[PDB]
Amino acid sequence: HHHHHHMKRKGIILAGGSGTRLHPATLAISKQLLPVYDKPMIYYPLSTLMLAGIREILIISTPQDTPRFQQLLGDGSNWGLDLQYAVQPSPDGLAQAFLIGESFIGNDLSALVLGDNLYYGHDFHELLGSASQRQTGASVFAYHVLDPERYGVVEFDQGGKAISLEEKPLEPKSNYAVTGLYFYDQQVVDIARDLKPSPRGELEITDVNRAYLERGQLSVEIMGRGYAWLDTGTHDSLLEAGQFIATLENRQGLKVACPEEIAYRQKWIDAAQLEKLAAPLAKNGYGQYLKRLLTETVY
Amino acid sequence: MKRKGIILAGGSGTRLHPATLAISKQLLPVYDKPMIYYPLSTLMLAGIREILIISTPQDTPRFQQLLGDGSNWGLDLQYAVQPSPDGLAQAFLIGESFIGNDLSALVLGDNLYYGHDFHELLGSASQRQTGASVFAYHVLDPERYGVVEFDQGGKAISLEEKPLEPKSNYAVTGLYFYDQQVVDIARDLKPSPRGELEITDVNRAYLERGQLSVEIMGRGYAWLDTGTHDSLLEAGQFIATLENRQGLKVACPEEIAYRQKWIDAAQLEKLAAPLAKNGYGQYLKRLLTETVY
Amino acid sequence: HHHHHHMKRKGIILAGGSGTRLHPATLAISKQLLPVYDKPMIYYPLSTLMLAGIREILIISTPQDTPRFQQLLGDGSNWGLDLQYAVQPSPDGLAQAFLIGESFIGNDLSALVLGDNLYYGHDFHELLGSASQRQTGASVFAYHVLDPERYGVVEFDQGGKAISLEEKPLEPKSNYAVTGLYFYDQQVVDIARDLKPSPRGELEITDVNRAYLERGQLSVEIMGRGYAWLDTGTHDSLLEAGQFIATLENRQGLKVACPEEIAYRQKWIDAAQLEKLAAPLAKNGYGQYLKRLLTETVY
Amino acid sequence: MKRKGIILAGGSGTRLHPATLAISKQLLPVYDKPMIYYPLSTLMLAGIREILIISTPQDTPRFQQLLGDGSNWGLDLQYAVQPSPDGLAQAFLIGESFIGNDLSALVLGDNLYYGHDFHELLGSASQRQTGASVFAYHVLDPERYGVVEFDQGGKAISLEEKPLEPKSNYAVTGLYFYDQQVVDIARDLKPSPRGELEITDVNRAYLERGQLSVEIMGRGYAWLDTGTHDSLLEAGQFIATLENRQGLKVACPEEIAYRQKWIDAAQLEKLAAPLAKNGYGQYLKRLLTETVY
Ligand SMILES: CCCCn1c(N)c(NC2CCCC2)c(=O)[nH]c1=O
Ligand SMILES: CCCCn1c(N)c(NC2CCCC2)c(=O)[nH]c1=O
Ligand SMILES: CCCCn1c(N)c(NC2CCCC2)c(=O)[nH]c1=O
Ligand SMILES: CCCCn1c(N)c(NC2CCCC2)c(=O)[nH]c1=O
Ligand SMILES: [Cl-]
Ligand SMILES: [Cl-]
Ligand SMILES: [Cl-]
Ligand SMILES: [Cl-]
């Protein structure tokens, strides 16, 4: 039949099971609800999508913990967002987010962020700007790491063009890891639908990204060393993430990834609504911070 | 006499929100294990196997799911709820049927202890059949706690809850040992001006009868602060540093049960299986074939 | 007499006495020789000047510790720099750097950096670019902090224009502190020469900066929240700086403020010289890092 | 008999360069005080007042300038140099005239100890008039140290320096107590295959004669690692966390002298004056008017 065209990207946060890897610390609750310093882990990737201009977001979690995410985040109306929820009853790979989220995505562009990924740095809005404005193909970011063998790894030719992707190579071609933020056009659901499980029994995002690379439609932007990309894969790195955020916030008197603040600065909520959000937390430092936002110019 | 244990892992208000909006803080990790493993381990080191866990109504199933009936660790665990956070002394009303005619010990669910000869420091406390025992610890900020005043001879002469002008820098820690009088003492308490049933009022009732032993927990012990986001982080880094230096874990309940002979090598081996692919199960397996002094 | 004109900025690092403030930790050696994680504190501001394109640099320190800085840094030839040394026998204020450094500066533009100031973030080169290219007036940077009362504080009007500077105000007009990096034109020595000591008995850099502000020649650029500016004023903040750097380096496998690296990337030293510098440290991680630089492309 | 102390604060090679290019690492701070305050404090807690500080030729004046002749802290300090880092046992050759006919104790200048009843753990070691005493501590990485092997009955039966296949996870810590035999034992040592005069060879000489006491330093003690940039940082954060929780300092020599009655209140007051405007002098002044148990 005839369609009519007259595009506005949706977000997905994958906040499912990290298995038994961090047990016993994660036996009672999902990793993405653990605090990083002063706020739940999922605030950080949520703030990243909000900074990209994305207001319609799907949170994917385990059946057990979906109510906890819903109690925390609600339907998003308090922050000028619309949040929906889906369950992932078995952790079958990152690319499953597109099958789980097929009806949510519909015919729109999308962005996937991992619920345990934290980003920090200057001009990040503009880094997210470039990817968000590409209405065709896929956009990912590459970041120099110590241990690229843990990640999807990008190989560049002498001219700096991305030429191959390898998932967890034993002998990485570079130290550039693909970060856990991915922008896709309308092709991604069909690409994901045709994936077959890897030997590990997982639907791999690296295979989705290679499909775009083979089409000549993968943009790989470098996220430079002046940004911090942290992912909280071990108890040690979780502690380090906490200390990192605390050092920054206590130095600056500003918070990293405060969703209320980002919504207020994006003009998705106004002063009066921000005042209402501050009221219940008025006796703790978080509520006091929200109140200070109303009567301070921050450049 | 038998001494039963109680862990009070109740509601911390909105003080650490939004970090604790989704889950009570005693279920959050300090480094590599749930916070509640630490006070549970303190009770187990004191020789206590029958333990009541008190939490909010919402989070009890999460404590029940986490720890079970205790049989896997040679423990006998029970659960109860504190509907509203109306004072630590409420633990003894909630736990009255659990305690019965036995001796008791209460530990706060967010308190972490570290140091040498803790098994022996708890032992002296545990073996007193009469009176109550508490521990006093020198802190920077005594006004946050129950504060002990001593006379020139070193005798405890008063207790004040959150004094505006503290009489000393010695705070009462979150571990309390009680004889058979405590339930009856708790039952006669009235709410404070702040509206709570105060453990300090329980402790003063013992003090007035000369039945409160206040032992100093020395500066060589760590009693770690988890009252702020800052202190939470510091405690994690503290545990991290010790464990990574030593290759030994702090407050591993499976290990403590094994060393107490509450479970045998065959049971420890079964416990190590599920987590065999990560650091915790690996640690438990190594316990079977290493002598640790 | 007649002059002839046919400009190339010099750097000064003030690494003098921080008095008895951090005693006993600093009784045996200067604060600016204390390590921040894996390298001496002074590497960080030195790297900042190098990133600004500055190769001719004066290090000002106490008479007692000048030999220690000289043993560490030499005459700079190893890194494609020219380093000179001057002493500050009494800590009489930051603005004294221009009197001490008068002959060194000569008729050139200059930049002053505090020897205990660390900077980190994306596009910092370009932030330093704007200030370095202003051949007239002065340039400073303002950074939102928790405790502006400890600093020189900038007041902005509703349009964002800097309108006043106050040194350690009890009731700060804003939370924007002036950071410890200052760019000056040829007027600064004369401005400094005419300063009188403040009530505290110090020649104040805030007075130098106000002189420029009153002339309409002070540029105040915002250093945004996506940058880290740390200054190591307490034992606590020193520890935090150390942890911050360690988290970044161990995540990335890249070093912050490695002068050898910056000189190599600026083409002030070539591959062969970098190889020579790596040789003496070849058995430790620092030397191994220098060696890796030669056979890796870092974007 | 009198027991004299030695702190070996010698050269650490190029291992932590460039961080330590300008100054030896034992003069760098761990949090709020020079690293050497920590092992110095360990000797003072052991009751030792006559102490020889051994350092590189370049940095001795910096140790001399820092600590003086010790008279301000009720100590008797002397200095000597180790020209080349050719083994820890060289301390006994360098210190031979200092030691004379007395008992001795050696502590490494980069070793930090924390825990309860340390004064008493050093006391038992200090009061043995014959033989040698060392402490063994469970670590993650025994291959970095002198490693102790025990038989099934718990008896130390061998020592190996940096074994490729360690026999246990028990490392010998950097505190050693010796009788009058050690100088003569050190004098007869030959360099190892690695070219050093090994303290482990000294300790094995005592072991062969059944005169080596190997006491376990339990997991409730912290023996902190300052061998890497990472472990340096961890130690600082460790001290920070304790001191900020307690409002008491770890290894404050002025405080320890005061408590040992080696200096009186009038002397402590004079010591507090110079630093009266910062946290350290403030701490010292507060010591005059607070009872700390
Ligand atoms: C729309 C204006 C947003 C300004 N902003 C911002 N960019 C960030 N950056 C953080 C967010 C994701 C981590 C980088 C932040 O944490 N808080 C903010 O208020
Ligand atoms: C019955 C033998 C138990 C020995 N033990 C022990 N004492 C502790 N320490 C305690 C002291 C600080 C809280 C943990 C521990 O964490 N794990 C153990 O296995
Ligand atoms: C000329 C190319 C330099 C690239 N670079 C760089 N910009 C920094 N940024 C750091 C330096 C001052 C702290 C920000 C660094 O630490 N190491 C580097 O190699
Ligand atoms: C003679 C009474 C001394 C009491 N004392 C003491 N034991 C220590 N602890 C020691 C144990 C860890 C190294 C510091 C300390 O740091 N400061 C002190 O004043
Ligand atoms: Cl960058
Ligand atoms: Cl103690
Ligand atoms: Cl920014
Ligand atoms: Cl112990």
Q: Is C69 close to ligand 3, i.e. is its CB under 6 Å away?
A: no
Q: Which residue among C37, C41, C44, C47 is best mutated to probe the pocket of ligand 3, counting the most ligand atoms within 8 A of its Cβ?
A: C47
Q: What crossing angle do the helices spanning C235-252 and D229-246 adopt, rounded to 10°?
A: 140
Cα angle value B52/B54/B57 (rounded, 5°): 135
Residues after which a C–N gap over 2.5 Å breaks chain D: none
C 227-256 → A contacts, CB under 8 A: 227-230, 237, 240, 243-244, 247-248, 250-254
D173 CA → ligand 8 middle, Å? 15
Q: Give the other-Cβ count within 10 Å of D23's Cβ.
A: 23
C 84-143 → A contacts, CB under 8 A: 120-124, 143
Q: List, in sequence order, every beta strand (DSSP E) within B162-291.
A: 170-178, 212-216, 222-224
CA nearest neighbour of B134 among B190, B100, B179: B179
- Evaluate the omega torsion of the peptide bond into residue A91 and state whether it is cis, within 30 degrees of 0: no
H runs (alpha helix) in D209-278: 229-246, 253-259, 265-272
Residue C15, strand partner residues: C61
Domain B1-293 bears CATH identifier 3.90.1150.10: no
- Atom 18 of ligand 2: nearest residue by CA position: B256
Q: How far apart are CA C256 and CA C249, in angstroms?
A: 7
Residue B107, strand partner residues: B7, B175
Here the tokens at position C76 are: 């700079």
A40 CA → ligand 1 middle, Å? 16
- Position of tokens 């000047």? C49
Q: How far apart are CA A49 and CA A37, in angstroms?
A: 20
Nearest CA in chain B to A69: B22
Q: How far apart are CA C136 and CA A294, in angstroms?
A: 37
Does A288 lie at the interface with C, CB-CB under 8 angstroms?
no
Q: Is C265 close to ligand 3, i.e. is its CB under 6 Å away?
A: yes
Here the tokens at position D117 are: 């009843």
Q: How far apart are CA A266 and CA A202, in angstroms?
A: 37
Q: What crossing angle do the helices spanning A271-278 and A285-293 adopt, rounded to 10°?
A: 160
- Looking at chain B, which subunits does it touch, using at least 3 CB pairs closer than 8 Å as the criterion? A, D
Helix (H) or strand (E) run with residue C166 in it:
strand C162-167
Q: β-strand B76-81 against B103-108: which pairing, if any?
A: unpaired
Residues C174, C143: contact at Cβ < 8 Å?
A: no
Chain B residues in contact with D246 by the CB 8 A cut-off are 137-140, 219
Question: Residue B36: helix, strand or coil by DSSP?
Answer: coil
Q: How far apart are CA A156 and CA C121, in angstroms?
A: 24
H runs (alpha helix) in chain C: 43-51, 66-73, 96-100, 102-105, 124-133, 188-193, 205-214, 235-252, 259-265, 271-278, 285-293
Q: How far apart are CA A88 and CA A86, in angstroms?
A: 7
Q: How far apart are CA B260 and CA C128, in angstroms?
A: 64
CATH number of the A1-299 domain:
3.90.550.10
Q: Which ligand is nearest to the CA of C119?
A: 3
Tally A–B CB contacts below 8 A.
Answer: 97
Question: Residue B74: helix, strand or coil by DSSP?
Answer: coil
Helix (H) or strand (E) run with residue D80 in it:
strand D76-81
Q: Is B107 left (phi over 0), alpha (psi -120 to 50) or beta?
A: beta
Residue A14, strand partner residues: A60, A114
Helix (H) or strand (E) run with residue B185 in it:
helix B182-187
Here the tokens at position D121 are: 């753990």
Chain D residues in contact with C69 by the CB 8 A cut-off are 22
CA nearest neighbour of C72 among C259, C222, C209: C259
Here the tokens at position C119 are: 């900077």
C144 CA → ligand 1 middle, Å? 14
The residue type found at B142 is P
Helix (H) or strand (E) run with residue B94 in it:
helix B90-94
Chain C residues in contact with A244 by the CB 8 A cut-off are 243-244, 247
Residues A84, A57: contact at Cβ < 8 Å?
A: yes
DSSP state of B40: H
Shortest distance between the Cα of B64 and any Cα of chain D, in A, equals 30
Centroid of chain to Cα D118: 13
Q: How far apart are CA B20 and CA B109, in angstroms?
A: 15
Note whether D28 contacts C34, CB cutoff 8 Å.
Answer: yes
Chain D residues in contact with B238 by the CB 8 A cut-off are 238, 241
Q: How far apart are CA D96 and CA D77, in angstroms?
A: 15
- Position of tokens 């008791």? B104
Residue-range domain boundaries for chain A? 1-299
A 9-28 → C contacts, CB under 8 A: none
Residues D87, D41: contact at Cβ < 8 Å?
A: no
Q: β-strand B3-9 against B50-55: which pairing, if any?
A: parallel
For A258, list phi and psi in degrees, rounded to 5.
-95, 110
CA nearest neighbour of A72 among A256, A259, A243: A259
Q: List, in sequence order, every beta strand (DSSP E) within chain B.
A: 3-9, 29-30, 33-34, 50-55, 76-81, 103-108, 112-114, 132-138, 146-150, 156-161, 170-178, 212-216, 222-224
Q: Which residues of D are annotated as a binding site?
A: 8, 10, 12-15, 25-26, 82, 87, 110-111, 115-119, 146, 161-162, 172, 220, 251, 255
Note whether C284 contacts D240, CB cutoff 8 Å.
Answer: no
Q: How far apart are CA B25 and CA A106, in angstroms?
A: 39
Note whether A252 contacts C124, CB cutoff 8 Å.
Answer: no
CA nearest neighbour of C298 among A210, A145, A147: A145
HEC states along chain A? CCCCCCCCCEEEEEECCCCCCCCCCCCCCCHHHCEECCEECCHHHHHHHHHCCCCEEEEEECCCCHHHHHHHHCCCHHHCCEEEEEECCCCCCCCHHHHHCHHHHCCCCEEEEECCCEEECCCHHHHHHHHHHCCCCEEEEEEECCCHHHCEEEEECCCCCEEEEEECCCCCCCCEEECCEEEECCCHHHHHHCCCCCCCCCCCHHHHHHHHHHCCCEEEEECCCCCEEECCCCHHHHHHHHHHHHHHHHHHCCCCCCHHHHHHHCCCCCHHHHHHHHCCCCCCHHHHHHHHHCCCCCC
CA torsion, ordered D28, D33, D38, D41, to nearest 10 deg: 140
CA distances from D86 to A99, D111, D220 (A): 66, 19, 33
Here the tokens at position A171 are: 């002998």
Cα angle value B69/B71/B76 (rounded, 5°): 60
Residues C44, C119: contact at Cβ < 8 Å?
A: yes
Residue D55, strand partner residues: D9, D81
**Which among C226, C250, C253 is the nearest to A121, CB-wise?**
C226
Residues A69, A59: contact at Cβ < 8 Å?
A: yes
- Evaluate the omega torsion of the peptide bond into residue C45 and state whether it is cis, within 30 degrees of 0: no
Q: How far apart are CA D22 and CA A49, in angstroms?
A: 47
CA nearest neighbour of A178 among A88, A53, A94: A94
B13 known ligand binder:
yes
- Atom 3 of ligand 2: nearest residue by CA position: B256
Print burial letters for D109-140: b (CB count within 10 Å at least 16), e (below 16).
bbbbbbbbbbbebbeebbebeeebbbbbbbbe
